[PDB]
XYZ file of C-alpha atoms in Angstrom:
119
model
C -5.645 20.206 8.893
C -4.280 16.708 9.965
C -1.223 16.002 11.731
C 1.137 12.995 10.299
C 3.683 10.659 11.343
C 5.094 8.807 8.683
C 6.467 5.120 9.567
C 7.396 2.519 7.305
C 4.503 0.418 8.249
C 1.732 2.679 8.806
C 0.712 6.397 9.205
C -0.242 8.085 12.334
C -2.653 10.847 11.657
C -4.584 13.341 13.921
C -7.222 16.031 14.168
C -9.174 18.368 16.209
C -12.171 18.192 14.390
C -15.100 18.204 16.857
C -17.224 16.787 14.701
C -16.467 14.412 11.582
C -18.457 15.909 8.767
C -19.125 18.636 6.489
C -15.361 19.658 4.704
C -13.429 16.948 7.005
C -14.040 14.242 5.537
C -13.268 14.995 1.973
C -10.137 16.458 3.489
C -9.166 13.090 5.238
C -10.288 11.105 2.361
C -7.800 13.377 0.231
C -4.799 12.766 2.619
C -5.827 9.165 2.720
C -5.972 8.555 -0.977
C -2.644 10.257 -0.738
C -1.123 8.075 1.413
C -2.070 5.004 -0.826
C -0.496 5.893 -3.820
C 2.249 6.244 -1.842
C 2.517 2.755 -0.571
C 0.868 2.376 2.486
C -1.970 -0.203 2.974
C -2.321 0.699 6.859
C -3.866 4.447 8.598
C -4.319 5.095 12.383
C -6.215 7.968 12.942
C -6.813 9.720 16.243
C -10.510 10.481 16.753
C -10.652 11.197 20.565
C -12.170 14.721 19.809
C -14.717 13.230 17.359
C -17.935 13.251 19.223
C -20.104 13.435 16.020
C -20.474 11.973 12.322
C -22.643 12.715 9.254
C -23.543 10.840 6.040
C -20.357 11.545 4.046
C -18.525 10.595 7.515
C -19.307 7.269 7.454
C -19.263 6.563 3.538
C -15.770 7.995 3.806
C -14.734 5.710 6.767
C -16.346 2.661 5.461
C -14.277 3.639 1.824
C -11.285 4.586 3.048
C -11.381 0.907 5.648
C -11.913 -0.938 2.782
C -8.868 0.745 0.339
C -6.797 -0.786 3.609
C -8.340 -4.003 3.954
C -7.884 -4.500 -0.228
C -3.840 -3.922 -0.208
C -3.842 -6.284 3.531
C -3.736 -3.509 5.892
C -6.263 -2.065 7.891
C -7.574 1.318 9.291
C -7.671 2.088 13.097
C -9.074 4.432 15.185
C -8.478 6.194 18.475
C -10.843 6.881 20.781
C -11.114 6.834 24.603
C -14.839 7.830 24.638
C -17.198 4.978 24.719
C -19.918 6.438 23.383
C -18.328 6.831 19.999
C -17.026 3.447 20.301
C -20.501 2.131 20.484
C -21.460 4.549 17.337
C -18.459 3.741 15.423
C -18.972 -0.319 15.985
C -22.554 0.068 14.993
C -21.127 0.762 11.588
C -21.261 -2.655 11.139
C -18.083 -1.885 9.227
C -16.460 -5.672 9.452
C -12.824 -4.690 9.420
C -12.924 -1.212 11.322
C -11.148 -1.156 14.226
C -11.260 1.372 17.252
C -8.773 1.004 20.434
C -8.179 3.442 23.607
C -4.532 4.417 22.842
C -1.833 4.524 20.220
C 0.234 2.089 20.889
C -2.691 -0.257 20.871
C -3.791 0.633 17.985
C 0.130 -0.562 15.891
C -0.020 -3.345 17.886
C -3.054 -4.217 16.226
C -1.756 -3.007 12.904
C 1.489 -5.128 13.105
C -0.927 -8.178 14.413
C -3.101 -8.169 11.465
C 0.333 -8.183 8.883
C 1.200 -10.999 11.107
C -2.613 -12.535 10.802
C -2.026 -12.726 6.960
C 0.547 -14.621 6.781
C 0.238 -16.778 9.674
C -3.232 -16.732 10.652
């Protein structure tokens, strides 16, 4: 079960999940898909008590990244751990972005709407 905050911008969603995999991530690709029908082109997820991923993990992240890169938004994640960072980056996922804290990460969401139209 994910926590949301609704914005007009973005959505701010969290978890608990230890471990992204198994259930989860058809769960968060539900909520995701969602979200998009509903207008919004931009997700910020907080992953800090991810340590893990599986197959379906990281098909689902590298989907759900690219449904907000298509409508000009973009997906970030939120992560202190550095370790995960280094996992998550080795994705090789182009657009996916993963920053220490929240309000880092809609800075970067408002900076890439900016980055469209004046990049």
């Amino acid at each position: 079960d994910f926590k949301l905050e609704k914005k007009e911008q973005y959505v701010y969603i969290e978890t608990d999940a230890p471990a992204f995999a198994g259930d989860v991530p058809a769960a968060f690709e539900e909520t995701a898909r969602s979200l998009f029908r509903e207008g919004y082109h931009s997700l910020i997820v907080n992953m800090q008590t991810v340590k893990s991923l599986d197959a379906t993990g990281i098909t689902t992240l590298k989907k759900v990244n690219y449904l907000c890169a298509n409508d000009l938004g973009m997906l970030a994640i939120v992560t202190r751990d550095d370790d995960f960072i280094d996992l998550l980056e080795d994705l090789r996922i182009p657009d996916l972005t993963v920053l220490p804290t929240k309000e880092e990460a809609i800075d970067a969401v408002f900076m890439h709407s900016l980055e469209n139209e004046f990049g």
